[PDB]
Write a protein that binds this ligand. Structure first.
Ligand SMILES: Nc1ncnc2c1ncn2[C@@H]1O[C@H](CSCC[C@H](N)C(=O)O)[C@@H](O)[C@H]1O
Ligand SMILES: [Zn+2]
Ligand SMILES: [Zn+2]
Length: 883
C-alpha cells in the first residue's frame, strides 16, 4: 500500500546475492578494524568506540538534531557505545545504562573511554517491567529487525507504548529508535506522538539499507510522511541500476581517562594531616601534579603522581577439584565464579559508587540518642573490665610472618617480612619517634595504603567482578593502634561472656547453639537484615560515640588513645591507585573525616559495638519508647535510661551481633516496621525497599548469619549436634579457584586438601562435599602440608591445616571440647556421622539422584587413579573411600 511496505515486500522477494548487492550499496561506514582488534584484546585504554552506535549518536549531535545534557539514561545500552559517547559530551553529568544481556544477546563491555567514571551500567532488565525515572536526556536504541512488517509494527509499538511513560516526565532531549515508520498505523501514531511531545524523525545514512530504521530526536522538527517518503524513495531508487560506491569515514576517537565532576567534599583540617601531605610531596616532588579530571565527589583531592600498576584480574583454576567435579561444569553458579579485579580500574569502578558517598547527617535527636546509648553501653561493658596499655611483647606474641608491610616512606623500606622487622630496634626507634610526636599532637607517619581485595566472587557480565577496597596502615601505626585500643580484642570485650550480644571468638561450630538458645526465648519472629555496606555508612557521630570509652582510662593512655583516634580515625589520609590516560598508571592522595576502613585493628570491635547501639535503638523505636518527633529533638531524655536500665541487658542477650552482620529476636513484630531511626542514621537495609517491612523468620534453622544457616542433627545413636550450612555451589566454586599466579601444582594440591579437610571438618553433613572431600584427600598425597586460605571469615580459626587425621580433630572440636554436649563418648567411625535430610540437602544445592552425579560417583576411582597418575606415581596416597 505504502512506499515503505512495497520496498519491504521487494526486499523479501530477493535472493541472497541480490541481498548482498543491495545491503551495503552506497551508504557511509566507519573504519572499524582498529576498534575490532582493541575489542579482541579488550584494550580499555585505546579509547575506541565499543560499537557502531557511537558514530550514529556522534552524527546526530554534531549535525545538531539532538541537545544532550545533564542526567542521561540509555535504554538498551547493549555494549554501551551510546552511553560511552554520552560520557564525552561537555554538558553531561551522569550516565545510567540499562539492558537485558543473558543468554545469546549482548552484555555490556567495560573500557576506559573519556568520562567512564560517570557510567553506571546494569543488565538483566526487561525495561517494560521497570518504572520510570526523571532523565534530562532520554535514549533508547531498542529495535529488533525482522522479515515481516507484521512484527516490526508490533515491536516498535510495544517500544513506544513503553517510552511514552518516560517521555511524559519531560526530558530536555531524547533519541528513540523507530524500526518501522512506513505503515498506516505507524505513520498515524508517529504523527500523534510528534504532535503531543515534539521532536522529529531523521534517517541516518550510516545505517544499513536492509531496514527502514529511523530515529526520533528532540532538536529537529519535520513531518512524518515527508521524511518517511524521502527514505522510502531513496531506498527504492538505490536498489536498481548500479551498485553505488560505499563511503569510508574514520571512527570517532573517544579519548581516555576520567572526567571533572562536582567536588562536594568537606574541607580538610590542614594542620592535622598537613605534615603527612607535605612529607609525601617532599618525597615525590619529582613528578607531583594535580589532575583536574578527578572522579571523586566526597573525598578531598590532595594530588597525584606517577607510579607502577598493581595486581591483576587473571583467575586460575585448581584442576584437582575441577576434574574431581566434572558434573558441575554446567551450573552457572559454579563455573561463573572467578577472581576479583584488583587493578586500579577494578578498584576504582567499585570505589566511585560504593565508597564515594556522603551520608545524611543525622538529626540532633538521633545524635543525642546515639550518644546516650553509646555512653550506657561503654558504662555496662567497662564495668567488669577496664583498659590497659598493651605491650610490645604481646604484639610480637600475636604476630606471624604473613602480614603486610605498608611500605610508604623511605625509612620504612628496609624489611621484607614482619618477623624480620619486629626484631630490629630501628623499627621500635621509629615507633617511639611517632609516639612522642603523637603525645605532642603531631602525626607524621600514620598514613593509609589502599588497594582492592583478592577475593573469589561471582562473575558479572561473564567477566571478573570489581574488587571492594581494603585500606590498612603501615605496621608501626598498627602497633600504635594496638597499644592504645587493641586491649578491646585482647581481653575479649566483645565476648558473649562480658557483652552478651557479641560473639567475639566463637567458631562456626558453636554459633548455631546461640541461635537455638535465642529461639527458646519467647517473643516475636527472628529478624536478621544485612546493613548495606557497613563501613562506608559510619558517620562522624558514630566515631565520636566510639571515642567515649576514653572516659575510663588513665591520663597517659587517654593521651595516646585520643591522639590516635583524632589524628587517625576522625581525619583519614589515603593513598590509592588510579589508571591514567594512554596506558600510564598513577597514585592519588585523598582525605576525609568519616567512614572506617577494614584494615583498622579494631574493625570488628567498633563495628560490633556501634551495631549493638543501632540494634538497641531499633528495639527502642520498635517497642514505642522513642516517639516520632524525637528524631528532631529529645523530649524527656530520662525515659531512655529508664528503659535501658530496666530491659537493656534483657534485650541485649536476645541478640547475636558480629561486626557487619546481626541477628535479633525482639519482643513483638513491630520491629519489622520500626525503620525510621534506622534510616535517619544512614544505616539502610541492603537491596530491599527502604520503607518496606522486614522479612522475618519463624523456624530458627533457616536463619542466615555470616553467610550460613544452621541445622540440627540427631546422631545415629542419640545425641544432638548443631552444624552450619550454606549453598553447595558456592563452596564448590570457591574450591575451584586458585588464588596465586605462577603457583606450582604442589601448592594448588595443598589448597585442594585444605578445602577437602575444611569440608570434612565442617560440611561433612553434605553428601557431595564429604564424597568429593574424601576423593580429594585420597587422590592427594597424605604427606603434603595444607597451605593457603579458604574462606576469609574470622570464625574459621584454621583447624583443618594439619596432616593429623580428621576423625580425631572431629572428635576434639565436636565432642571433647563441645561445651554444649555433656556425653564425652568419642564415636569411632566415619559413617556413624549422619548426613543432612535428603530434601534439605537437595534444597541447598545437591545433585543427588541425577544421572551426572550417578555416573561420576560410580567412576570415582578411575578419576582418582587418573589424578594420582597425573600428579606422579609412587607417592604415598591413601584410599579413604570405604562405604
Ligand atoms: N527491552 C530491552 N531492554 C534492554 N536491552 C535490550 C532490550 N531488547 C534488546 N536488548 C538488548 O540490548 C541491545 C540494544 S542495541 C545495542 C546498541 C547500543 N545502545 C549501542 O550504543 O550501540 C540489543 O543488542 C539487545 O540484545
Ligand atoms: Zn601518626
Ligand atoms: Zn541447609
Amino acid at each position: 500500500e505504502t512506499l515503505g511496505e512495497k520496498w519491504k515486500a521487494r526486499l523479501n522477494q530477493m535472493s541472497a546475492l541480490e541481498f548482498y548487492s543491495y545491503k551495503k550499496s552506497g551508504i557511509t561506514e566507519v573504519c572499524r578494524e582498529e576498534a575490532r582488534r582493541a575489542l579482541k584484546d579488550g584494550v580499555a585504554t585505546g579509547g575506541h568506540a565499543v560499537s557502531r552506535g557511537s558514530a550514529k549518536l556522534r552524527w546526530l549531535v554534531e549535525r545538531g538534531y539532538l541537545q544532550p545534557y545533564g542526567k542521561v539514561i540509555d535504554l538498551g545500552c547493549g555494549r554501551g557505545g551510546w552511553s560511552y559517547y554520552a560520557a564525552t559530551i561537555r554538558k553531561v553529568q551522569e550516565v545510567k545504562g540499562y539492558t537485558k544481556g543473558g543468554p545469546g544477546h549482548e552484555e555490556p563491555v567495560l573500557v576506559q573511554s573519556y568520562g567512564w567514571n560517570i557510567v553506571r551500567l546494569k543488565s538483566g532488565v526487561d525495561v517494560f517491567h521497570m518504572a520510570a525515572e526523571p532523565c534530562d536526556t532520554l535514549l533508547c536504541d531498542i529495535g529488533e529487525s525482522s522479515s515481516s512488517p507484521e512484527v516490526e509494527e508490533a515491536r516498535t509499538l510495544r517500544v513506544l507504548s513503553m517510552v511514552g511513560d518516560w517521555l511524559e516526565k519531560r526530558p530536555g532531549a531524547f533519541c528513540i529508535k523507530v524500526l518501522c515508520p512506513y505503515t498506516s498505523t505507524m505513520m498515524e501514531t508517529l504523527e500523534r506522538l510528534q504532535r503531543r511531545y515534539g521532536g522529529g524523525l531523521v534517517r541516518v545514512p550510516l545505517s544499513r539499507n536492509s531496514t527502514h530504521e529511523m530515529y526520533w530526536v528532540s532538536g529537529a522538527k519535520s513531518n512524518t510522511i515527508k521524511s518517511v517518503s524521502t527514505t522510502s524513495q531513496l531506498l527504492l531508487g538505490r536498489m536498481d541500476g548500479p551498485r553505488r560506491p560505499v563511503k569510508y569515514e574514520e571512527d570517532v576517537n573517544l579519548g581516555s581517562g576520567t572526567r571533572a565532576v562536582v567536588s562536594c567534599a568537606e574541607a580538610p583540617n590542614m594542620k592535622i594531616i598537613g605534615n603527612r601531605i607535605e612529607r609525601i610531596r617532599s618525597e615525590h616532588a619529582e613528578t607531583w601534579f594535580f589532575d583536574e579530571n578527578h572522579p571523586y565527589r566526597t573525598w578531598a583531592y590532595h594530588g597525584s603522581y606517577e607510579a607502577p600498576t598493581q595486581g591483576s584480574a587473571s583467575s586460575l583454576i585448581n584442576g584437582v577439584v575441577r576434574l574431581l567435579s566434572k558434573p558441575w561444569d554446567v551450573v552457572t553458579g559454579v563455573t561463573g565464579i572467578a577472581m576479583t579485579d584488583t587493578t586500579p580500574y577494578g578498584q576504582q569502578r567499585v570505589f566511585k559508587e560504593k565508597v564515594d558517598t556522603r551520608v545524611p547527617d543525622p538529626q540532633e535527636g538521633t545524635r543525642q540518642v546515639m550518644s546516650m546509648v553509646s555512653s550506657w553501653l561503654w558504662k555496662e561493658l567497662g564495668k567488669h573490665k577496664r583498659p590497659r596499655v598493651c605491650t610490645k611483647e604481646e604484639f610480637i606474641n600475636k604476630v606471624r610472618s604473613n602480614a603486610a608491610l605498608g611500605a610508604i616512606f623511605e625509612e620504612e623500606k628496609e624489611w621484607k617480612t614482619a618477623v624480620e622487622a619486629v626484631n630490629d630496634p630501628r623499627f621500635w626507634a621509629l615507633v617511639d619517634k611517632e609516639r612522642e610526636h603523637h603525645l605532642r599532637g603531631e602525626c607524621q607517619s600514620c598514613v593509609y595504603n589502599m588497594m582492592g581485595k583478592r577475593e573469589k566472587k561471582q562473575g558479572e557480565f561473564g567477566k571478573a567482578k570489581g574488587s571492594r577496597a581494603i585500606w590498612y596502615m603501615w605496621l608501626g601505626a598498627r602497633f600504635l593502634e594496638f597499644e592504645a585500643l587493641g586491649f578491646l580484642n585482647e581481653d575479649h570485650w566483645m565476648g558473649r561472656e562480658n557483652s552478651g550480644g557479641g560473639v567475639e571468638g566463637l567458631g562456626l561450630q558453636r554459633l548455631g547453639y546461640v541461635l537455638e538458645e535465642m529461639s527458646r526465648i519467647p517473643g516475636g519472629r527472628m529478624y536478621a537484615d544485612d546493613t548495606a555496606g557497613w563501613d562506608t555508612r559510619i558517620s562522624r557521630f558514630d566515631l565520636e560515640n566510639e571515642a567515649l570509652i576514653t572516659n575510663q582510662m588513665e591520663k597517659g593512655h587517654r593521651a595516646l588513645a585520643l591522639a590516635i583516634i583524632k589524628y587517625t580515625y576522625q581525619n583519614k589520609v589515603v593513598k590509592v591507585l588510579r589508571p591514567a590516560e594512554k596506558g600510564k598508571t598513577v597514585m592519588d592522595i585523598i582525605s576525609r573525616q568519616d567512614q572506617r576502613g577494614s584494615g583498622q585493628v579494631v574493625t570488628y570491635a567498633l563495628n560490633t559495638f556501634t551495631n549493638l547501639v543501632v540494634q538497641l535503638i531499633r528495639n527502642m523505636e520498635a517497642e514505642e519508647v522513642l516517639e516520632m518527633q524525637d528524631l528532631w529533638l529529645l523530649r524527656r531524655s530520662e525515659k531512655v535510661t529508664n528503659w535501658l536500665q530496666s530491659n537493656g541487658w534483657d534485650r541485649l542477650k536476645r541478640m547475636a551481633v558480629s561486626g557487619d552482620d546481626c541477628v535479633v529476636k525482639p519482643i513483638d513484630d513491630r520491629f519489622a516496621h520500626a525503620l525510621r531511626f534506622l534510616n535517619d542514621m544512614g544505616k539502610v537495609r541492603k537491596d530491599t525497599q527502604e520503607w518496606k517491612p522486614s522479612t522475618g523468620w519463624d523456624n530458627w534453622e533457616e536463619v542466615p548469619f555470616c553467610s550460613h544457616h544452621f541445622n540440627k542433627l540427631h546422631l545415629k545413636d542419640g545425641r544432638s549436634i548443631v552444624v552450619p550450612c550454606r549453598h553447595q555451589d558456592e563452596l564448590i566454586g570457591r574450591a575451584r579457584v586458585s588464588p596465586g599466579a605462577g603457583w606450582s601444582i604442589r601448592e594448588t594440591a595443598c589448597l585442594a586438601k585444605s578445602y577437602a579437610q575444611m569440608w570434612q571438618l565442617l560440611y561433612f553433613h553434605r553428601r557431595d562435599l564429604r564424597l568429593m572431600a574424601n576423593a580429594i584427600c585420597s587422590s592427594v598425597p597424605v604427606d603434603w602440608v595444607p597451605t593457603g586460605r579458604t574462606t576469609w571469615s574470622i570464625h574459621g580459626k584454621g583447624e583443618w591445616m594439619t596432616t593429623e587425621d580428621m576423625l580425631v580433630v572431629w572428635n576434639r572440636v565436636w565432642i571433647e571440647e563441645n561445651d554444649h554436649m555433656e556425653d564425652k563418648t568419642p564415636v569411632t567411625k566415619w559413617t556413624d556421622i549422619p548426613y543432612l535430610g535428603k530434601r534439605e540437602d537437595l534444597w541447598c544445592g545437591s545433585l543427588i539422584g541425577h544421572r551426572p552425579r550417578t555416573t561420576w560417583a560410580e567412576n570415582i576411582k578411575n578419576t582418582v587413579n587418573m589424578v594420582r597418575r597425573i600428579i606422579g606415581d609412587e607417592e604415598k596416597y591413601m584410599d579413604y573411600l570405604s562405604t
